[PDB]
Design a protein around this ligand. Structure first.
Ligand SMILES: Cc1nc(C)c(-c2cc(C(=O)N3CCN(c4ccccc4)CC3)n[nH]2)s1
Ligand SMILES: [Cl-]
Length: 212
């Protein structure tokens, strides 16, 4: 068997450099640009980097590791001792992600949780010893953004100033998630447009202010 995702890891393992997350980033960026696209960006990576650098989170939740691009891009910017938790529902992508972090030298900042987001979010406190989350990046199924944001509320995982950065909120779009965070007083929201497919997409930054 030879999947697109094995093919990406293998281009990285040949062209990027062991323990250099940026040559991993550019090799992936290079692969998805010249060889076959994958569901990856440097234009939205600039936005993702600015938000990591602005808020210096000590504990990040990512929903949707996939191949490990956005986990290499985040964890490369985290301070010593900070953690990334990444949930991946497909075990083969989870293996790609473990190897992509192992090659990039970041497998000690990341913990991969294999599971659907709404099964693992309730276990975060008991099992992975989380108190609150400093940042949350949502890049999974667009119809889970809103219910997972409220599930994170329920379980008391968001604090005042938690950053939620939501990808692909324009295309495919997350209309329900955007209406809620923009309309709720618990969230202060900034929309970052980024092109893609030559289409305007966007990320939403939504900062939690505390319950209503
Ligand atoms: C309830 C859930 N909890 C989690 C943790 C979920 C999750 C999302 C992802 C992910 O990263 N992508 C992106 C890639 N994509 C895809 C790409 C091409 C074709 C079809 C699908 C699958 C979803 N991995 N696990 S869904
Ligand atoms: Cl499910």
């Amino acid at each position: 068997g030879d999947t697109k995702e094995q093919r990406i890891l293998r281009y990285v393992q040949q062209n990027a450099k062991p323990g250099d997350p940026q040559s991993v980033l550019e090799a992936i960026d290079t692969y998805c640009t010249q060889k076959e696209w994958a569901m990856v960006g440097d234009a939205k990576g600039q936005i993702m980097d600015a938000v990591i650098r602005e808020y210096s989170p000590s504990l990040v939740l990512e929903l949707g590791a996939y191949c490990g691009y956005s986990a290499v891009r985040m964890a490369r910017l985290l301070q010593p001792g900070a953690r990334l938790l990444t949930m991946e529902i497909n075990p083969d992508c989870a293996a790609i992600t473990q190897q992509m972090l192992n090659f990039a030298g970041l497998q000690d900042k990341v913990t991969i949780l294999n599971g659907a987001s709404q099964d693992l979010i309730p276990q975060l406190k008991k099992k992975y010893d989380v108190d609150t989350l400093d940042m949350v990046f949502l890049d999974h199924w667009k119809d889970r953004y809103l219910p997972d944001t409220l599930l994170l509320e329920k379980c008391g995982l968001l604090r005042k100033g938690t950053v939620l950065l939501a990808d692909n909120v324009i295309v495919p779009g997350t209309p329900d998630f955007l209406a809620y965070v923009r309309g709720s007083s618990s969230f202060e929201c900034t929309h970052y447009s980024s092109y893609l497919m030559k289409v305007v997409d966007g990320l939403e930054k939504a900062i939690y202010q505390g319950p209503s």
